[PDB]
């Protein structure tokens, strides 16, 4: 009975309620994010369950500040909760220090909020991983990813979701360090379609959002003129 | 603050902690109250006298106000909390109404307090029942009984404690207008009901009688043997 609480280690030193909560992320569809020379491009394989949902429901790409975006994967109600936490931390930073929050600090303030629910029996861990991404002129492009345990690492590319391992091999053969943001979007859409299973989970709507030098460091959804010119590019190499 | 639901429902709709607090009442010493025409008589059954009690301070008939006095059965320590909180409410009611309480008012206060610990967090129910007797300003005698559930009823005669299933079967066949006529014959109706339950017998009971103004007085031990010899 070593797995009913987050305030309980296993006899081999594991907190299973944390490790069960990251099975919930592994049951969610794959969201990837690639840090390049000009910025960060997110991409979510958003599984649309019913035909009755409007195109844009259950949105997985969040704006947590005007320069920071958030791609989530996992239990979506927990993800919208942490998006509000990351918005409050980015708000309180500007109200106390007067400038846009660095992505290093914002990722660490939110990961220590996630970590705070891995310690007690009064709460459960969050059932979501989520990537953060921003661009500054001074700080450059940055991509951090926070696990349900509360650990935050910087990435050149992260691939949370079901096809986590299969998407990491596609990001690893990409050489993102020299490529620009309009070239990464054509590649993120390739990686999303190649890891999507056209047998198990049927319908899916691609969601793409960058933040980079071409937006003067603003995070926004990729426009449909550039989005459709990458979905057409992705199907042409899917053969 | 310890906020945990102690009294919860069970399948078939029972509150176990309320039912188990009523088993604490049935393990207590037997208390009998009957209601006469201008007299109310409370009597409790002292289980053991032991020749070493200072009997002044284990009396089970208290006095809530000048017009209201009660007798309990069950957990003696739970009663003393109920007796004292009823005495505070009887004084707050003289403060705000400029009148002594009615007997049904302090019965409602005791019952709603007993209901409150069956439904609040972190509390067990009181393990007591309370036979409350008194007189109105009109002079009508009253006799009430609260349960650990918080339910209260008026009674012509009632019995709580151990053996009360047999004392109430006695009183339902012997309570009439003729035995409730004389004030002394009303007092022997409690003593006859107690001696059916006292398994050792004798002058090992306690009994308090309250008439109208010139109010409550608990009867002495040799003043109780005068009635027990008149029923021998």
């Amino acid at each position: 009975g070593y797995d009913l609480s987050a305030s309980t280690f296993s006899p081999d030193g594991r907190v299973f309620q944390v490790e069960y909560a990251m099975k919930a992320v592994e049951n969610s569809s794959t969201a990837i994010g690639i840090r390049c020379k000009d910025g960060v491009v997110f991409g979510v394989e958003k599984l649309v369950l019913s035909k009755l949902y409007e195109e844009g429901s259950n949105k997985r790409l969040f704006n947590v500040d005007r320069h920071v975006g958030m791609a989530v994967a996992g239990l979506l109600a927990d993800a919208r909760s942490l998006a509000d936490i990351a918005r409050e931390e980015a708000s309180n930073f500007r109200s106390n220090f007067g400038y846009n929050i660095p992505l290093k600090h914002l990722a660490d303030r939110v990961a220590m909020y996630v970590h705070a629910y891995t310690l007690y029996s009064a709460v459960r861990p969050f059932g979501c991983s989520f990537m953060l991404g921003s661009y500054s002129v001074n700080d450059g492009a940055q991509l951090y990813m926070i696990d349900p345990s509360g650990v935050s690492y910087g990435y050149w590319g992260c691939a949370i979701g079901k096809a986590r391992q299969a998407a990491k091999t596609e990001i690893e053969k990409l050489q993102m360090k020299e490529m620009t943001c309009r070239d990464i979007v054509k590649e993120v859409a390739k990686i999303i379609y190649i890891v999507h299973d056209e047998v198990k989970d049927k319908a899916f709507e691609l969601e793409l959002s960058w933040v980079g030098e071409l937006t003067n460091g603003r995070h926004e959804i990729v426009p449909k003129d550039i989005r459709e010119e990458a979905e057409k590019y992705a199907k042409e190499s899917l053969k | 603050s310890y906020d945990r639901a102690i009294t919860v429902f069970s399948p078939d709709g029972h509150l176990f902690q309320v039912e188990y607090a009523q088993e604490a009442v049935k393990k207590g010493s037997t208390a009998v109250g009957v209601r006469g025409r201008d007299i109310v008589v409370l009597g409790v059954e002292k289980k053991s006298v032991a020749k070493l009690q200072d009997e002044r301070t284990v009396r089970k008939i208290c006095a809530l106000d000048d017009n209201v006095c009660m007798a309990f059965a069950g957990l003696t320590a739970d009663a003393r909390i109920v007796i004292n909180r009823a005495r505070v409410e009887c004084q707050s009611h003289r403060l705000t109404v400029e009148d002594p309480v009615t007997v049904e008012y302090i019965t409602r206060y005791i019952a709603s307090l007993k209901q409150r610990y069956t439904q609040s967090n972190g509390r067990r129910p009181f393990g007591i029942s309370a036979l409350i007797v008194g007189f109105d300003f009109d002079g009508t005698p009253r006799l009430y009984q609260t349960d650990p559930s918080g339910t209260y009823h008026a009674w012509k005669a009632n019995a709580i404690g151990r053996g009360a299933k047999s004392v109430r079967e006695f009183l339902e066949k012997n309570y009439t207008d003729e035995a409730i006529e004389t004030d002394d014959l009303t007092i022997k109706l409690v003593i006859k009901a107690l001696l059916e339950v006292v398994q050792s017998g004798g002058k090992n009971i306690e009994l308090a009688v309250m008439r109208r103004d010139q109010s409550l007085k608990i009867l002495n031990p040799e003043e109780i043997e005068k009635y027990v010899a008149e029923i021998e």
Partner: protein, 247 residues
Amino acid sequence: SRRYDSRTTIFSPEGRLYQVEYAMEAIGHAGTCLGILANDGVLLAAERRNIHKLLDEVFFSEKIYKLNEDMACSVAGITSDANVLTNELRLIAQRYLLQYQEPIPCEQLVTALCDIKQAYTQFGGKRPFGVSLLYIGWDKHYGFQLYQSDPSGNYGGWKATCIGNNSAAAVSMLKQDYKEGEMTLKSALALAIKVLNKTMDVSKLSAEKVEIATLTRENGKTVIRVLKQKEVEQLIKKHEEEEAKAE
């Protein structure tokens, strides 16, 4: 968390409080403590437990703990929980004096501790105090008094009672050699040593294994006086010799 809780303040299906009844058995293996009411005083006769050879003699007693100018107690059970109770009785005894400028009546002090003890048996989810404890005292309204207070929170006034180990055998001996309205103080000291022989399993007494305190009135002032070692050794020898003159 509901898993880790033990539910200390619930009822048994027979109508019992387990943690109260389990605290009562902590006391039946504690030091034997008795109290006897006389016509001019009340005494306490605690059998001393900490009787090791390498113990010092710091503070006035081992299990007495005078509460007031006019009343003292005596504890048996958990030693540590008794110290929390006896600080609390001294606060109640001094909050009455602060509020009324009269000493606390002894029944009103026992009642107030027994409300604190009852409150841990009904709400809060804590364990009860596993301390039953005696009380001796004087007040204006009834004079010399003797009380006992179980961990349930109910109390009683006694003429002679006993708590601790072999209390049931000690009570029955106090049912027969105690006379109501006829016990002097010096007769009650000899009854205390008589009970502390057939209820202590050792061969005899030595006054390092007992502690006696008497409470009397002397010129309008209550004196509480723990008897010294020679004062009890004379009482042991007055009973160790008089038992030879009865067989």
